[PDB]
Design a protein around this ligand. Structure first.
Ligand SMILES: Nc1ncnc2c1ncn2[C@@H]1O[C@H](CN(CCNc2ncnc3c2ncn3[C@@H]2O[C@H](CO)[C@@H](O)[C@H]2O)CC[C@H](N)C(=O)O)[C@@H](O)[C@H]1O
Length: 278
C-alpha cells in the first residue's frame, strides 16, 4: 500500500559514476556552507532518495572499495560520513542518492527543491522528506525546474542536473536547460552529470555548451575503460559551471586515489580541465 513503502533496489547504485558525482556534489555543498547565508539545492532528476544494495551489484566495485579505507582522502570525508550515517551496522546496505547527500549536509537555513517523474521512485522521494520543512518535492519535469525555480530567494545555490540519458534528447535538453537557468541565475553553481557511451555524443554536447557563451566551465571525468563504440558506459563526468574556488584543486588531489581504488587495472583515465575558463 501507499502508506508503507519499500525502499527501491538498485543494481547500479554506488558505482564508480555515483562515487564521482556525489563526491563532487558534497564538495560543492561544503563550499557553499563557508558563508552563513542560506542557499538552495535544486535536484532536477532526484531519483528515489536512497537505494537498497544487493549479478552482484556495482556498489561492490565502487563505494565498497573506498568507504572503509584507512587512508581515505580528506576531500572524501563529508561524502563518506553521509554513507556511514545510513549504514551504522558497518555493512553496506543502503546507498544515499543525491537528495539524501543534500538532506544530511544542508543546514537549517538552506532549502531543497527536488523533482522526479518516475511513478514508483517519486513516492519514495516524497517519503524521505515528509518531515523536512526545508524541502519541496514535486512529480514534475526536471528541466522545467530550471525555468520555474530560479533564481532562488536566497540568491545562492547548487543546481544538480542528472537525467537518465535514456532518451538521446537528454544530451540536448541538459544544455538548453542550463542556458535557461543560467540566464535567470548567472551566479549559481550548476553541476551536470554525463555518461560516456559514445565519445561523439559528449563531444557534441560540450560543443553546444560552449555555444551558450557561458564562461567558467570545469570538466571532471573518470573513465574506467578507454572510449569504445560497444562497451556501454566506459566513463562518466561532472561539468561544473561556476565551480567553488577549491574544487579544481580538490579533484586533482583526490582523483588519482579514487582511480586507483575504482579501477584495479589502471585503465581509462581521470582528468580535470577547463571547457571554458574565466
Ligand atoms: N541504467 C540504470 N538504471 C537504473 N538506475 C541506474 C542506472 N544507472 C545508474 N542508476 C542509478 O540510478 C541513479 C540515477 N537516477 C535514477 C535512475 N534513472 C535511470 N534510468 C535508466 N537509465 C539510467 C538512469 N540513470 C542512468 N541511466 C543510464 O545507464 C548508464 C549508467 O549506468 C548510463 O547510460 C545512464 O545514463 C537518480 C539521479 C539522482 N540525481 C541521484 O544522484 O541519486 C544513478 O545515480 C545510479 O545510482
Amino acid at each position: 500500500g501507499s502508506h508503507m513503502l519499500s525502499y527501491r533496489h538498485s543494481f547500479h547504485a554506488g558505482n564508480h559514476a555515483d562515487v564521482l558525482k556525489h563526491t563532487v556534489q558534497s564538495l560543492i555543498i561544503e563550499s557553499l556552507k563557508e558563508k552563513d547565508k542560506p542557499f538552495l539545492y535544486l535536484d532536477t532528476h532526484a531519483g528515489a532518495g536512497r537505494y537498497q544494495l544487493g549479478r552482484t551489484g556495482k556498489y561492490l566495485e565502487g563505494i565498497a572499495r573506498i568507504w572503509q579505507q584507512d587512508d581515505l582522502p580528506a576531500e572524501l570525508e563529508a561524502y563518506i560520513n553521509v554513507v556511514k550515517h545510513f549504514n551504522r551496522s558497518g555493512q553496506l546496505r543502503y546507498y544515499p542518492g543525491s537528495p539524501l547527500i543534500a538532506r544530511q549536509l544542508l543546514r537549517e537555513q538552506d532549502s531543497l527543491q527536488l523533482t522526479e517523474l518516475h511513478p514508483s521512485d517519486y513516492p519514495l522521494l516524497r517519503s524521505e522528506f515528509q518531515k523536512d520543512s526545508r524541502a519541496r518535492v514535486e512529480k514534475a519535469d526536471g528541466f522545467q525546474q530550471l525555468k520555474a525555480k530560479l533564481p532562488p530567494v536566497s540568491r545562492r545555490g547548487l543546481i544538480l542536473i542528472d537525467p537518465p540519458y535514456e532518451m538521446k534528447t537528454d544530451y540536448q535538453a541538459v544544455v538548453s536547460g542550463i542556458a535557461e537557468g543560467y540566464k535567470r541565475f548567472a551566479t549559481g553553481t550548476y553541476a551536470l552529470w554525463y555518461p560516456v557511451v559514445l565519445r561523439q555524443q559528449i563531444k557534441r554536447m560540450i560543443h553546444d555548451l560552449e555555444a551558450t557563451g557561458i564562461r567558467k566551465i570545469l570538466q571532471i571525468e573518470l573513465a574506467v575503460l578507454p572510449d569504445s563504440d560497444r562497451r556501454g558506459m566506459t566513463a562518466s563526468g561532472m561539468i561544473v559551471i561556476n565551480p567553488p574556488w577549491k574544487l579544481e584543486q580538490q579533484m586533482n588531489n583526490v582523483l588519482p586515489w579514487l582511480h586507483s581504488k575504482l579501477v584495479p587495472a589502471g585503465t581509462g583515465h581521470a582528468t580535470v580541465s577547463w571547457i571554458v575558463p574565466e
